[PDB]
């Protein structure tokens with residue numbers, strides 16, 4: 001069966017050279033002496049990694065070389081980058097970190113570069129080479145995932161609570177949905193904001209999330225807003241367990257105006 | 259006879275040094291040829307200073323087919339896995355990876371097109387330089403990111419996660435260390451957190467790190483935690499940690515389990531934390547810890 005895999009080898013090499021058994025192996029090498037390449041690899045970097053090469057002199061910060069892949073990556077003309085410094089291309093709060101990664105081996109850091117005034121997180125991986133020194137590095141976009149900022153910009157807000165019902169966390173959207181500044185909800189039990197006639201309802205559900213773990217329960221009740229109006233509101237809540245220990249970290253609620 | 263000098267014929271005409279190209283079995287020469295021209299084909303479908311690009315990478319490039327064939331591996335793979343390009347090229351990804359990750363790998367090779375995952379792969383490079391044999395291989399987690407493409411194909415760059423003991427890349431002023439129990443409770447962190455996020459290392463000790471990241475990031479962190487536990491290293495997505503007196507900082511943390519070397523049980527998590535911003539929205543408070 002070893003000869004069988006050999007035969008399959010030669011059979012599908014023949015399949016990919018469109019142009020006997022002794023002949024095909026000598027014939028094949030003609031086919032690629034006709035033709036791995038620097039540029040090919042670079043395309044790979046742009047495809048697998050979305051990254052671009054760049055060399056900057058590490059005292060001026062002046063970029064001495066930019067891969068053309070800068071344009072696909074940062075919507076940035078090459079003409080921009082070459083003939084500038086890296087401090088121009090990076091968020092003004094990353095100049096410190098930059099100046100430290102650039103002083104007198106390998107180098108690896110994260111920073112925020114401009115596009116074509118929006119910034120993107122770039123993973124820079126490279127090394128310092130003599131030339132009196134220059135850093136040659138690859139800048140890679142979306143090596144990671146971005147944070148969810150959907151409370152910064154509505155009729156819902158998420159909150160965390162302890163087993164008792166204390167607001168231990170509330171996102172910024174609450175000021176818009178119930179009118180309270182975050183400071184005026186945290187530390188107080190959620191049932192303090194509930195209309196008396198619904199307080200047991202809410203309470204019962206807090207007893208069951210903390211007993212039916214993995215299941216989301218929903219309760220509708222009236223909420224005291226900052227203006228003291230009773231706002232109907234549905235709460236979907238589940239209890240969040242620690243992935244390692246199952247220790248119940250907190251209860252998670254999404255509080256949605258109804 | 260006439261067939262061996264032609265095997266050396268194609269050997270010294272594949273993009274390899276005479277050195278390595280000399281010693282190959284001809285089955286190998288086949289595999290390498292076929293994968294080389296297959297690679298060139300896909301890269302024709304793609305386009306339409308090699309030392310620089312290759313050496314500036316903290317990972318290696320792999321292109322792997324839908325049935326698991328590693329039709330190309332960049333040449334620096336030896337520097338991370340120890341396994342050479344010649345040894346793996348054309349063989350199944352499923353023969354050099356942790357079997358428990360196979361269904362995950364199988365799940366990423368198929369059918370958006372962007373891919374981001376973690377994969378334990380055989381590794382024979384002892385951190386030191388020296389190389390060991392395949393029977394004596396360590397499992398190394400690789401952070402793989404790339405694209406699936408058409409006839410399916412996966413094109414990934416796989417960076418290893420630096421192990422916080424053996425680091426030869428400098429760290430800057432926006433990066434601080436932290437130690438966690440397995441449940442991710444704080445049991446140590448740098449003094450620089452004080453400058454960077456405003457906390458004294460005194461007060462986080464014993465606190466569950468689940469209480470300090472913005473709730474909108476929970477979905478990601480949890481899996482990070484779960485990943486970190488089943489393979490032993492993770493690179494988290496970017497997420498927001500709640501600063502001390504309001505606001506948040508953007509953070510990215512490499513996590514790794516460290517094992518007691520005496521009894522081999524997992525001791526803890528070591529987190530390298532990259533701070534990605536100055537404190538933002540310093541006026542908003544999110545948690546009951548910041549109200550004080």
Ligand SMILES: O=S1(=O)N=C(Nc2ccccc2N2CCCC2)c2ccccc21
Nearest residue numbers: 436467468470471479483494499513529
């Ligand atoms: O803002 S945090 O208090 N949450 C953190 N990380 C985290 C939290 C909850 C579950 C899992 C994790 N990870 C992230 C990466 C691996 C384990 C973390 C890590 C270091 C310093 C400060 C913080």
